[PDB]
Amino acid sequence: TSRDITVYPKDFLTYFQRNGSAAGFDYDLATYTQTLTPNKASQAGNVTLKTKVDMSQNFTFTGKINLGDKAQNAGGADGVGFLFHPGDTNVVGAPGGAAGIGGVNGAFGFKLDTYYNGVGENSFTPDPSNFKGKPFGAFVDGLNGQAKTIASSAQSISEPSNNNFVDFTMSYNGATKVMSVTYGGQTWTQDVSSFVGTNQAMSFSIAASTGAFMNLQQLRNVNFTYTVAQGTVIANYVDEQGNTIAQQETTSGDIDTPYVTSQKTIPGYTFKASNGAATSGNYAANDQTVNYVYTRNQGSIDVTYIDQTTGQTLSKKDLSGGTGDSSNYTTTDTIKSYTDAGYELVSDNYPSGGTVFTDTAQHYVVNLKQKLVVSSEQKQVNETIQYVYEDGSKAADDYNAPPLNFTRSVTTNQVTGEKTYGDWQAQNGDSFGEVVSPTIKGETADQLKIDAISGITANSADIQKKVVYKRN
Ligand SMILES: OC[C@H]1O[C@H](O)[C@@H](O)[C@@H](O)[C@@H]1O
Ligand SMILES: [Ca+2]
């Protein structure tokens, strides 16, 4: 590959980051020596690799390790750990029994344990009982966070003595997935495929730890030949409330080589903003993540009610929801309310099957008019002539003249109450007849005829007359 590099002893600080206690000590370029811990108590120091490692390529790690001058019995602690995890380059494991492996997830590697921890806690499972107070080198399974020492790898090592540097070698076949560690004519082997999984890019941390007991722990003449793993960009396509609304796009590439991400076009949604990384940039050692946030496309429906009679808006129900939600709305009730008030439905554009919000607006109309009830008014003007004697006794039957009837339409607006009368129309005529007063033998009428009367209007008063007969 083009990312196949060999870390030289003089460029150590280029590819490795002194962290913790280690940051107090400069790299001595005469010896090529990096202190991890000094010979003081409760110290922690490490170097982290600035990149990650393609675990689908071969790597060869060479150097010398000073484990100190004291052994456990003389007050010597805690050892040096080599950490392999998939998380952040700048993460390191817990000190003590965790040996700088435990406390990280998906964590494996090699310890040189210069202190026996029989009492276990969360960071680490007790050290193998067969190595009570004895220096040993092992492989560690820190996948579940808790560093477990594999007793099948548990081998003794030489006690830290007069601050001496023993040769260390860690070799790795990309294709076998087998790790080979040599420390002063003790060798280790293990298939690490059960750990690398699929990640094929792990962070590397060499980490020393003192506690109550101490030791100078130091590194010298570090030769790392490995393939720089390539950076990942994750792009998530999520709604406003975090729920994912389109498949994610995990695109990988060589560090410091460009990356691009696509603003997906999502049915039912419109792009709002891109929280997180740039949508465009350069690949980097750690995972970068750009989140595309989308808004839920919202539909309009407005159902206007109109009083035709006035050409005035009665009521207007604005509805808004999500492109494809039902509205669950029916006119029927709002219609009723107007109909009961004396209105009359004309038309209803509102679909019978509720409705559904769409990316385009809907506008429906309910046409209502003030009802009008047509009645009839009738009025009658009569004429009566009473034929009587001087004592009031009837001389002759009362004449009721042919009645003069009159009709008018009455339109009552069932909303305003406003009664629009039509006109008075004469059914019978406008004029009452002449009535010649009957002749009675041996009597004389005070009026021998009642004259015909013209100009009868529907408001006219009923005519009442009285003819008195006198004897002779
Ligand atoms: O250093 C010896 C010992 O001292 C303390 O008890 C802690 O800091 C331990 O984890 C450590 O291993
Ligand atoms: Ca231990």
Residue numbers in the entry: 40 to 511
From the paper:
Amino acid sequence analysis using the Phyre2 and Pfam servers indicated that the 120-kDa protein contained a leguminous-type (L-type) lectin domain (Lec), a mucin-binding protein domain (Mbp), and four mucus-binding protein repeats (MubRs), followed by a C-terminal LPXTG motif. Structural analysis revealed that YwfG28–511 is composed of three different domains: Lec, Mbp, and MubR.
To obtain crystals of substrate-bound YwfG, ligand-free crystals were soaked in a solution containing d-mannose or α-1,2-mannobiose. The structures of the d-mannose–and α-1,2-mannobiose–YwfG28–511 complexes were determined at 3.00 Å and 2.95 Å, respectively. In the Man–YwfG28–511 complex, the recognition of d-mannose by the Lec domain was the result of a hydrogen bond network involving six amino acid residues. The d-mannose-OH4 group interacted with the sidechain of Asn156 (Nδ2) coordinating with the calcium ion and sidechain of Asp117 (Oδ1) in the β6 strand. Furthermore, the d-mannose-OH3 group interacted indirectly with the main-chain N of Gly136 in loop 6–7 via a water molecule. In addition, the aromatic sidechain of Tyr154 formed a CH-π stacking interaction with the hydrophobic face of d-mannose. The only combination of variant and monosaccharide that showed an interaction was YwfG28–270 with d-mannose; that is, the Lec domain alone could bind to d-mannose.
